[PDB]
Amino acid sequence: FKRIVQRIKDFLR
Task: Say which experimental method was used.
Answer: NMR
What is the secondary structure of 1-13 as a DSSP string?
Answer: -HHHHHHHHHHH-
CA-based R_g, the chain, Å: 6
**Which residues, 6+ apart, have CB-to-CB distance to 2 below 8 Å?**
none
Nearest-angstrom CA–CA distance, 10 and 2: 12
What amino acid is encoded at 10 in this protein? D
Nearest-angstrom CA–CA distance, 8 and 13: 8
Dihedral Cα 5, 9, 11, 12, nearest 10 deg: 140
